[PDB]
Amino acid sequence: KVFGRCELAAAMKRHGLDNYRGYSLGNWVCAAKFESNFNTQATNRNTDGSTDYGILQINSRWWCNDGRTPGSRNLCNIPCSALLSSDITASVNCAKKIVSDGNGMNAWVAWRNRCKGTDVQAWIRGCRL
Numbered sequence: 001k002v003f004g005r006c007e008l009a010a011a012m013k014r015h016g017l018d019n020y021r022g023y024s025l026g027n028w029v030c031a032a033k034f035e036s037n038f039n040t041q042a043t044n045r046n047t048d049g050s051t052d053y054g055i056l057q058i059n060s061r062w063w064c065n066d067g068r069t070p071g072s073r074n075l076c077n078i079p080c081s082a083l084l085s086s087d088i089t090a091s092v093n094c095a096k097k098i099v100s101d102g103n104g105m106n107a108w109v110a111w112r113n114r115c116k117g118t119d120v121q122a123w124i125r126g127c128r129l
């Protein structure tokens with residue numbers, strides 16, 4: 001599923017991400033835009049052999065099991081394929097665990113390099129919640 005901007009902002013707000021660990025909704029929408037272009041089906045291989053999955057590009061090195069990342073963890077206790085669903089519940093619940101692990105949204109390279117210290121409120125401008 002390719003979300004619209006405000007459709008994704010509403011889905012993230014309904015799943016409890018607005019000001020989750022102090023990160024405003026626009027931070028989450030900006031992260032999703034630059035990680036996946038709002039596409040739940042996005043996958044990308046990392047240099048180490050792990051793979052990133054879904055709208056927030058969650059990595060199999062630590063967070064999910066994809067059956068092909070040897071010596072990795074599954075800290076979200078999910079198959080990586082759950083992160084590709086049109087339903088973002090699994091991605092949101094795993095993102096809450098990641099953002100709580102010590103580095104906050106710095107876990108998302110795209111967020112640090114493209115969203116952090118920008119006017120992220122722009123990403124929810126015009127949206128009905």
Ligand SMILES: [Cl-]
Pocket residue numbers: 021103104105
């Ligand atoms: Cl933080």
Ligand code: NA
Pocket residue numbers: 060061062063064065066069072073074
């Ligand atoms: Na894994």
